[PDB]
Structures are given as structure tokens and as C-alpha cells.
């Protein structure tokens, strides 16, 4: 587990500003490191299109973990509001596509193995917060990258 | 698992016909029941569009499992051939969207808990066989429904 702690703090350091700005949270979860990335500044609402300024952050994360063993699971999330858009068939679709964008962006980093990636759409099944206000529903719409040894 | 072993037989007998044809395969892996649906007959090649004749089979599976506890994880898979797609951005996308099509169909069944579902795209990271023949690749392109107690 030595590599877990060194890896976690290494990420914490490299992402210091993003963490301080609330755009990212990094915490240990059993034998996995979980990186949560807020919707604001990463995706436009209702869209899976990864936003320009966020691409490099994603690649940085990929850079940080490329030399570590273990599955990299990318998971998209929505709030519990039914979705009305013509582009996506449901919350499963949108949460799924968001994880797809991030995974596609990570595998562009040379040395980051494609084989390590797993993509998940979680729709509204794993809330962080009760869906009882706008601020909360927004925090639930994060994308998560889980590093699993 | 006795609730599972019963479940499994209920499934094996429910889908005996399709199990014969080779449309479905039912295995048991640990405390989990895996249903593998063959690409041919369920999805066109290169498409996440669930074929009309295959929809009722998916609903039937949702019916058979609606009464047991446990996560229902739907996973799409591809072979390792690069996707030549207008419609899909990558094998993550296509494999992902296939799992979305199946999940959306299952939750149309009354009493089936939306909250149980998980959607994953595995691309080519979990071959059942090496991608060295046309039969093998066709086989790798299945979709799986995993029932996890």
C-alpha cells in the first residue's frame, strides 16, 4: 500500500490549485484512490462534450497514474431529475458518454495503457448529496476516476 | 446463493430455447450470475441499436430478476478492430451505448428497480477469446447482464 499513499499525495500536490478551487477532490477509499471532478468547468450542462480548459487536467491525471498498476475506472453521474434533451436518450446515456469523453482524453497520454480503462454510467444511482437543492444536484453531477490496485 | 441457484434455474428454464440456439449463455461466477447475449440477432454490427425482435427477451430477463436483491450490471463489449464510425467516437462509446440500450429496455419492466442498474463499456479489454478469427471476434462482441447478490 506504500505506493497508494505516495501516489495519493503526489496527485494531491500536482493538483493543489484545482483542489483549493473546489474543482477536484481526492480521497482514499479502502484500497482505491478516488478522484472526483465537478461538472462546472469540465462539461457544459446537458452535454458530454469535455470542455477545452479541462482536457489538460484530465491528461495530467493520466500522466500521474500511468506508471502505477491497477484498473482505472471512469464513472459518470447525473442528478435525479429526468432529462430532457434530444441528443441523449436518458441519464444512463449522458452519464455514460461523459465517462467516455474522459477515458478517450486519458488514453492520448503516451504510456497510459488503454487496457487499464473501464467506463461506467451511473446515472443517479450513487448520489453524494441529497437531491434537494440546485447546488446539491450540481455536485452530484461529477465524474469520478477511481484508481484501483 | 440458494435464492441465486433457484434464480439461475428459473433463467436456464425460462430461456432454454435461446440457450439452445446460442443467443444466450448463462454461467455462474462466484456469487454472481452472468447472462451473455450474442451480438447476432440482438444488435446490428457497428450499432448500439437494440433490434426489435430482441427487445422482449431483454424485458423477459428484467422480469425474471426483478424480485431478487443485488446489482444488475450491464456491460457492452467490442473486439479489438479499430472502429470505422461516423456514429460512435470509439469502442468505449459503442460498447457503452449498447449497455445503455439494454438498461433502458430493462427498466421499462414494471417493478424492475432503476436503482439496481449499472452501465459499463468495456471496449476490447475483456475478450472471452483471442481476436484471431471472425468467429472469435463476433463472440467477443457480446453484451452481458450480471446479477450480483
Automatic annotation (TrEMBL), chains A, B:
<comment type="similarity">
    <text>Belongs to the MotB family.</text>
</comment>
<protein>
    <submittedName>
        <fullName>PomB</fullName>
    </submittedName>
</protein>
Amino acid at each position: 500500500s506504500q505506493e497508494m499513499e505516495t501516489l495519493m499525495e503526489s496527485i494531491k500536490k500536482a493538483l493543489e490549485r484545482e483542489i483549493e478551487q473546489g474543482a477536484i477532490e481526492v480521497e482514499n477509499l479502502g484500497q482505491q484512490i478516488v478522484i472526483r471532478m465537478r461538472e462546472k468547468g469540465a462539461f457544459p450542462e446537458g452535454s458530454a462534450f469535455l470542455q477545452p480548459k479541462f482536457r489538460p487536467l484530465v491528461r495530467q491525471i493520466a500522466e500521474l497514474v500511468k506508471d502505477v498498476p491497477g484498473i482505472v475506472r471512469v464513472s459518470g453521474h447525473t442528478d435525479n431529475r429526468p432529462l430532457d434533451s434530444e441528443l441523449y436518450r436518458s441519464n444512463w446515456d449522458l452519464s455514460s458518454q461523459r465517462a467516455v469523453s474522459v477515458a478517450q482524453e486519458m488514453e492520448k497520454v503516451r504510456g497510459f495503457s488503454h487496457q487499464r480503462l473501464r467506463v461506467r454510467g451511473m446515472a443517479d444511482t450513487e448520489p453524494l448529496l441529497p437531491n434537494d437543492s440546485d447546488d446539491n444536484r450540481a455536485l452530484n453531477r461529477r465524474v469520478e476516476i477511481s484508481i484501483m490496485q
